[PDB]
Design a binder for this molecule. Sequence first.
Ligand code: 446
Length: 330
Amino acid sequence: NQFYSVEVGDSTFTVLKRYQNLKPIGSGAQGIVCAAYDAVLDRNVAIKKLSRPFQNQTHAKRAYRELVLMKCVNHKNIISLLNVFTPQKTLEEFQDVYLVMELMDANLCQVIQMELDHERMSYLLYQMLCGIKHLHSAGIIHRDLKPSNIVVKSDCTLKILDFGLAVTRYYRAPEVILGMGYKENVDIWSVGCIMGEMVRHKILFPGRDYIDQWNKVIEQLGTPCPEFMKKLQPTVRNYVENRPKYAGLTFPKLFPDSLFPADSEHNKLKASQARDLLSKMLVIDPAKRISVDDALQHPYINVWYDPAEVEAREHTIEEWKELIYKEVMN
Ligand SMILES: COC(=O)c1c(-c2ccccc2)c2cc(Br)ccc2c(=O)n1Cc1ccc(NC(=O)CCC(=O)O)cc1
């Protein structure tokens, strides 16, 4: 037959013959993801499997949009879709989608673990921004960026895996958390958290439930200003003012020098520049937050700036199932 079946944990991966020697590498919201060798292209790939996405309105939209978007966006810092296929032969039996992306070497989350120097770090954030820029120019604002969905290669290149919204909430910008409208730089917020996390190694803004999310933010950055507050909904604004007030710490408090290299004037100045960048991304009020182009130009990041890289309705389950299937036959 054209396909065969390998058992991967609770999953049975039923795949085209071209894809050899499957090994599990990780697991997100859509399910398990395997690395695989691809005899046709003689190179390694990733196979994400989507089980029955049509049977939930959200997964259904994430899946449709992402097929569509995947062949519709082409940027070196956005993961590329190599192939899609289902092993089922009619709509009626259709059930699983298999997506073949390109493959890297690690998760952003692991790379946050290493004691990074400014070279490696500025260059990763440069790429993140280039990629977000490319998604923005496209008409896509991600709103749900997080490190586990970003992957890297030994040579330190970097791909975003997904397209956000249009569990872990630690990186959602405040405008999102509070549902209050947003512009492009809602994505800058998350770059903030990931940048802090690279420095602090702890998650910036942990917090158990959503209410406790907020409270770790203001604890550190301080309560937002009133012209912010006036923008919430009548009811919604009341809920939030009902906390203790905070001044929030300065950014050399939040990110002391012990955390950066300090032997050299070079290292002292770079640290300074990082803190400034952070100081401008991690700004609760978007109206005052740095935006994407200005961040690429920022001294911490621009030793990398390359204009070549920088520039470039609802349904029923049934209807979703068809739309998704139809899209898999291309
Ligand atoms: C931890 O996994 C990762 O970070 C990862 C994920 C990933 C998986 C699930 C959830 C989030 C992201 C990924 C997803 C898509 Br779609 C496309 C590419 C990647 C990727 O390149 N890596 C790096 C990677 C590439 C290869 C390996 N290692 C192996 O392939 C092991 C092979 C073996 O053991 O023989 C590990 C990570």
